[PDB]
Symmetry: D2
Subunit: 488 residues, 4 copies
């Protein structure tokens, strides 16, 4: 419906343009074609949205949970009617294949539903008192106005996980989508508005991170920021947020290890590895970005892995439902992947396959004979350039897996219960998966990292933990003597 | 003479720089204590890091064993800790006795719970998938503490943090280093493996900042001034380390018209003025319903008048000892000087000699007085009269702080409605503002900080969740589609 | 729904059918004895067939992901939303409930189904610390198996659906036998389930006599658990019969809840509340305020205001309009029992302040003062509209009277004093207690249940889940070790 | 030896006694009470009188008592080990383990006493506070067996005491001195009178009186399934709840990828420790055909090495004697059936006095008594299976479902088998009788209901109590004529 409606901000129940009126033109990464004019908001716009959410907060937090749940179920109903719209935009604006965006839309449905389901069930605790005649309990309360700042790779699911769960437990929301995915953010507003949430409870401000996002992060009426993006941005936001003592949730990068032992079905290992390391062009935080394989099956693994990679079809992702890979999000991502490929070649790496690019498209590029000094070993490679590392034993497997600043997810493939468990215990990561892909994700599990991959957990009640606080309350039923004045 | 404790060894700071600490009671010398630098902090940090794996991997029952031994040791040093809390900290007998009893309970509480911190088994939305969540320790944890309750605050942090398999670098407040050194004495005698607990005595902005900015420190739990906390949270950003921040308070104590007024004044005096008002959850702003204010004010001032201020070493019946240092006396004078100049009525107190200060009580206060706007960490207190419960709440919430708070009343509806409406991390009906148990979530909102400490809440602060799955079936994948 | 058009049948393994024996009886309205429908009179073979159907379906139903059972329950919720007018009409004409009563039960039933659906994916086990090195130690939740659901006639929809929806949610299958006085409500439940398309045998309905059909369920070896709401005696018999095959039970038995009123209350408000709490659904509520206890200082004005509001209650054909206050008792036997209660009180010198008449199945609320502990209406559950008011001198006395009963389901105190409220809440012996509200407060996710003769276990949300699942400790050991025998080694 | 009722050691009301002898050589051990119903009634009435003051002190006081009881137990360790051997037939190593685990049980109960939490709920109603308290059930009956009399009794007693129930304890008639020593320990620990009561007597007399009494709120029982069914039915008269820890016939499944020698060594410990007289003994050994030959050879090899002797002679005795001659008779019955049905007796069968040499059978089928019944003694069948499906079918072909184990290195096979085997507990690559102080221990099917260990014990002997506070007034629907 972009052919009949202007893309706008959503502030205090109203779709409207930024106060300056300034806009930019969102183009498709597929063919550079125009998608829509979109707001280029500034600080006054963020402030208006923040004030709207702050003024809406008390009423929203004080209604019974069941009523917030009702609003989220209504949102879910609206989402279901809007699925194709979301799929269409995820593809032409974000470059996602039919399969990727179908996955994203199906998961988003589950996220909204999960948030609705859990709203009424987030519990506090009744405690024993060490004192006589004392009732001692612990309540759960909303943090307040919550800033939601998101990336471009899974813009729908990542945004809605944060928005629906944050809204469910009685916070209001100021939402700033990634500048490469603004129409997705706008469709989210369309959804919310049609679900008729009270004005100010949810607000959309479209504009630059360093301007609109920074305002959200430094404003005293914002209680908490939940953020998903680059670790460098996370560190910046964490620093900025300190000024007003607001808490943060930081879902940052990853360089996930996929560990492949010698007792596996090697053909299966390769099929799983291709999917985990290259789905959505590798632009996934929990992409299998460093493939680690036991020497005993390495030659056969490498051959199969490449075989299946050679079958990957790259095309305009609107062409049909069977396209494997779309383009990268912009030209900067292409240039960066060229730097990764060139650095790996210069250092003596063997390029097994791929390496061409055109427009924003970038082929899978696979390397062996890499060492720890390679950029594609030291940095997050948010794209389809992937190293394969050969190791002699499980000790080395772990050493390499852990030889990174990151610590989001990870996986081992093996049929041996002992090796599976020891490697799982020893790999330093927020999440781990035995015999599955690295990017496994469920709507209600604690999703998050350690080390440079961030802080906190999201999904279900973990999302609730991030944006509530505990409130110890006592009642004393007896009177007592006090120690001062002692002369009594 | 006092030393650091690093990797199982009591040792001098690497520069040998020492410093003479004195007693707030009479200026007489107490000890020679380290003046450590960044290099010392790093040595403790590297120790803790290298002890971490062995410490975290032993079964929890083992860590609990160490803590029970520590409890055993602590119980033998009770009077030592009491003496130093009085001599170095200026605490009265009753105050330090209370602190030593609470400390006994804190260490015991952490031992009790070590074996019992659980993860979760989850339902999977997928077929043939086991899906569970483990608890894992954060790593090496910096522990930075204040001077007012240096023993109990330090131990709640040290003991609970150790319990769940974290190693510790500890830096006590510069005015209470000997309390710190005794803590290391107790830990050493409990025989915890080397590097698991490290003490470094040095300046906050040098040693503390090293802990806060170091790459191998996973988490810092901190108690102190709100401004210090904001600084610490900002420095922590660089390494994405997490923080627990227990900062200031300006706790409201609300008194309604249906109370036992005499009882209310007795409660108010203890809550507002215990330990000379140098308590984070001290009742720092007293708020009273107009219908009982005159009688309440007369009674409160009457019991304040009965307070005995003296050398806390003299005997067990001393109500108030001195403030910790001359900077605190200077600050209290500012609060009084400001209140007088804004038209406050000074009902009693204000006398100060050396570090001693007689509780100064004000009425005819308005929201612009520094003693209404700022945390008053000492014995200077406003009483404010309100007309109804709405104004009581408005005044209670008219602060940047939000640590604790309390209401005195026999009406169930007024009590609950006021508990609910008051913006604080903790609240208490018919008791003091500074109630504290070993295992309850202790902490604030607004400028009073972030996180909760006490029992399993301390465990939450210094561990993380780790989602682990096992998939028991193989499946087909969407790429490549030509398959 | 046309009452003359209804073909009422069992629902077993996916199909509506007649009892194997072809037997039936006629269900009549308690309002005027009008025929409602012929309904099955099933026997043991029908119960066995349902049980076998539930058992055979168990593994496929338990092993699917929780999310898939929630989907079924959401679908059930969708169907129920369409069937509301139908459910309300049968609750009124078959159960004798007023419009306002049945509207309330249907609204609550919708919340109960939704609640079970919401929680299905979120019932968690535990990851534990091991005292042994190299050991992983966890606790899974597993469904109990086939569960028998045996229900009463007073709130037949909401009590049935609480039990059924939560039980199904966590992967048990169900064999359900409604109260013989409310069979059509059970049949409409099976219609809802059938329309929601649950797999065959997951839910079964058998309409028949408790001592026949009900007993087969309780004694059968393929039944893992029985959840039962009814009379304390029936419960005690069920608990005994269940021991044979070591199946567990949930027992929601009678109450005789106290409503304690202190001297500091708004007395007029206390009176209005007490009328509602003591007499809604003609007192036919387990958590009805069955023994009103008031403080001497407000007793006289309280009794005046309370009797005044009772006098205002409109007794009438509950089908007539929406504003009828009270309808008939469920049947003639209930009227006769209430007559015994009234007669025993009059005979013992109790003072009857109002009511005590009755016509057909309709009974006029009878209020007594000047009673003592030997009165039957103080010693027994009075499941109908006969209520004693006891006057007390102080809070200690209020508590002693409150606790002087074999029962222990719920309770309430009215007071504005936080200390008296909490101390009374603490001293009263009941599974549930409400400060400044009615005795029969109930939410979909709270633990509902009693102590003493009022039963065992709790229902509502995760507590229903606790009843019909078990904990399963599983360990993995990652190191080999030496063993102490043979020591020669 | 006497009863312990309301703070006093005393002989039975009737004065009736009996002589308990050693299973090892028949010699006299002690005279013990033969109590009757009046004794059980005196104990119950005492527990009941004592309940309210015990349930209402703070949890921390009860924990304190348990910590006291723990220190007494530590002093009494050798006395317990001695009696468990001479009265129980236990070897040194067995009774050492029992006492070591009993120490952990008492400690564990103490640790958790302060931490049993209720819940704060969201209300679907406005202005409503909704919470759930934990309340102790009341007077609790504790009825126990003879095979692990100390640890089994102490798990039940310690945890039941912790959360504020009082106890009436009737031990197994073949292990009464262990029950008396437990009353010694409790008395020395100084629990308030009536809180713990010991009544030594006949199960059908004393036990039944306990199970049927109005003032007993709950019964926790460990024993034979038939007994459990008896108790469950008698319990119904007073609607008291029960915990039933009944028999087991646990499967030990061995797959073809194991270290066969290790599997054999594990099986021998698992199947025959304490003469196989353990609920969770590996009583049905199931081995994959591809390693069945080697496994059976190694297994019999290690069984032959078992040294059977007077358990009092030294610390390296593997097996002592069965508890009484009736057990030996039952074991002969089991062997006589298996021989009659075509079983091959590979080793053992010999018996003298109460001693019995472990009898191992192969060529068995499902109709053998040693496959259909719990074999609570040293007769064990080995069954060979052709695949995992068949392993599970046999494993599940029993009325019992207590524990179970699989030995394998394949993650898939271990998990698939774990979830398929119908039991309350399951262990991968370990013995079937793993037990920790705080885990949920209990079975399904004929093996019992409920769970014991730490907070699971707490769930069994407490109830949830929903309480609300409604803060607003409202209009009610009747009388409808009322505005
Ligand atoms: N605690 C609670 O939550 C709660 C809630 C509501 C009501 N109640 C209690 O329910 C009671 C009134 O209901 P009611 O007259 O329906 O009670 P009931 O006579 O005990 O009947 C309850 C159910 O048990 C069945 N039944 C009867 N005998 C049986 C047997 N030997 N084996 C198995 N099932 C058998 C009945 O079938 P038939 O109809 O064929 O007899 C009925 O479906 C009151 O005491 C009330 O307090 C309790
Ligand atoms: N699930 C577990 O955790 C577990 C652990 C260990 C053992 N067990 C089981 O316990 C069984 C062997 O022990 P056992 O020979 O002592 O079993 P038992 O014959 O049932 O005796 C157990 C206890 O119940 C008492 N008792 C007997 N009849 C009673 C009655 N009618 N009412 C009340 N109490 C009565 C007994 O007293 P008297 O001695 O005077 O007869 C004894 O103290 C085996 O099945 C074993 O598997 C289970």
């Amino acid at each position: 419906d972009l052919n009949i409606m202007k893309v706008a901000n959503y502030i205090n129940g109203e779709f409207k343009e930024p106060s300056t009126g300034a806009f930019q033109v969102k183009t498709s990464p597929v063919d550079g074609s125009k998608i829509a004019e979109v707001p280029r908001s500034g600080r006054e716009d963020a402030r208006e949205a923040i004030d709207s959410a702050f003024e809406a907060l008390k009423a929203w937090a004080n209604i019974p949970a069941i009523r917030r749940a009702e609003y989220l179920y209504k949102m879910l109903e609206v989402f279901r009617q809007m699925k194709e719209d979301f799929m269409k935009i995820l593809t032409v604006e974000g470059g996602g294949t039919y399969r990727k965006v179908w996955g994203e839309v199906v998961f988003t449905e589950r996220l909204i539903q999960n948030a609705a389901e859990l709203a009424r069930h987030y519990q506090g605790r009744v405690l024993q008192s060490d004192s006589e005649s004392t009732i001692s309990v612990v309540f759960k309360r909303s943090k307040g106005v919550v800033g939601v700042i998101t990336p471009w790779n899974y813009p729908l699911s990542i945004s809605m996980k944060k928005i629906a769960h944050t809204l469910a437990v009685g916070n209001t929301v100021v939402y700033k989508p990634a500048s490469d995915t603004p129409v997705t953010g706008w469709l989210i507003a369309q959804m919310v508005a049609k679900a008729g949430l009270p004005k100010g409870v949810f607000n959309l401000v479209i504009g630059p991170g360093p301007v609109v996002g920074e305002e959200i992060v430094t404003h005293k009426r914002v209680a908490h920021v939940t953020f998903t993006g680059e670790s460098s941005t996370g560190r910046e936001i964490a620093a900025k947020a300190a000024g007003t003592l607001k808490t943060v949730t930081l879902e940052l990068g990853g360089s996930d290890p996929l560990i492949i032992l010698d007792d596996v079905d090697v053909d299966y290992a390769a099929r799983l590895a291709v999917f985990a390391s290259l789905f959505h062009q590798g632009q996934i935080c929990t992409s299998a970005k460093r493939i680690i394989v036991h020497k005993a099956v390495a030659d056969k693994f490498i051959e199969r892995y490449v075989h299946y990679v050679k079958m990957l079809r790259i095309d305009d992702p609107r062409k049909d439902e069977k396209v494997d890979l779309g383009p990268l999000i912009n030209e900067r991502q292409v240039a960066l992947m060229k730097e990764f490929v060139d650095d790996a070649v210069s250092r003596g790496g063997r390029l097994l396959i791929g390496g061409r690019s055109w427009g924003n498209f970038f082929e899978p590029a696979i390397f062996v004979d890499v060492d720890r000094n390679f950029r594609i070993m030291r940095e997050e490679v948010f794209g389809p350039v992937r190293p394969i590392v050969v190791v002699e034993n499980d000790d080395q497997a772990v050493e390499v897996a852990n030889d990174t600043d990151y610590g989001l997810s990870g996986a081992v493939l093996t049929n041996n219960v002992n090796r599976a468990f020891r490697i799982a215990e020893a790999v330093e990561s927020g999440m781990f998966h035995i015999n599955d892909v690295t990017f496994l994700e469920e709507s209600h599990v604690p999703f998050g990292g350690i080390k440079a991959s961030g802080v906190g957990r999201e999904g279900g009640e973990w999302s609730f933990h991030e944006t509530t606080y505990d409130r110890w309350v006592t009642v004393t039923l007896r009177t007592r003597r006090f120690p001062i004045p002692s002369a009594l």
